[PDB]
Structure 1
Amino acid sequence: KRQVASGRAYIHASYNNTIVTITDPDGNPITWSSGGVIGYKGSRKGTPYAAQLAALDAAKKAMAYGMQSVDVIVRGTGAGREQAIRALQASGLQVKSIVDDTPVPHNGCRPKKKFRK
């Protein structure tokens, strides 16, 4: 029961799952959802539909706090990124900005064998 009414909607997409974290303007989270919060268990969590449901459940959780405006911040390349965007884009929440903050190193660490070359 905070009555935020404006905040930041983080989107963490990956080829395995898409997870939405909705925060106050300072960045502290209020509620959240993901593919596993909804009944999806296995690989289905990495779906654009699973993402859509996750972002909608996040937006509906945040409506209970009476939030209206969000700034969206996407991190990670992966399915359901743009579908979670479009889920929030008309979720009832007004999207004030979309920003891609996907972290890239400056050749910092050695990736797994999976990601080499």
Structure 2
Amino acid sequence: KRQVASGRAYIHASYNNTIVTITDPDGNPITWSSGGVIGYKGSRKGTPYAAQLAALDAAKKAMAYGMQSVDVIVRGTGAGREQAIRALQASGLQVKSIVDDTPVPHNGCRPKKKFR
């Protein structure tokens, strides 16, 4: 019963899964969801639809803690990255801002042979 009602929603998209984390204004998380939580299993787990369901789960779960006003941070890229945001915007949490935080190296680390 943490009583928050305003805070951060991170959306982490990948080409495999999609996760959503809701949090308090200084970043400590509240609840979350994902493609996996929502029933899905396989590849099936990273599709836009599953992104939707995941965002929506974590939004209902936020409702329970009292959440209203939410500032969104996307990180990552992948099919139904934006689906998750269009499914937050259908939630009834009212979204203040959307920023894009995908980290990028200033060219530090070798990648996997998958990446070159």
Q: Any idea what SS the aligned residue of 1:41 has?
A: coil
Q: CA deviation at 1:80?
A: 1.2
Q: TM-score, normalised by structure 1?
A: 0.98
Structure 2: how far apart are the matches of 1:15 and 1:79? 7
Runs of 5+ in structure 2 lacking a partner?
A: none
Deviations 1:53-74 (A, max 9, x none): 0000000000000100000000
Q: CA deviation at 1:79?
A: 1.1
Superposition RMSD on alpha carbons, in Å?
0.5
Structure 1: how far apart are the matches of 2:72 and 2:45? 21
Q: CA deviation at 1:3?
A: 1.1
Deviations 1:37-86 (A, max 9, x none): 01101111110000000000000000000100000000001111100000
How do 1:21-32 and structure 2 match up within 5 A? Answer: 21-32=21-32
Runs of 5+ in structure 1 lacking a partner?
A: none
The 4+ residue runs of structure 1 with deviation greater than 3 A are none
Q: Any idea what SS the aligned residue of 2:65 has?
A: coil
Q: TM-score, normalised by structure 2?
A: 0.99
Structure 2: how far apart are the matches of 1:88 and 1:58? 9
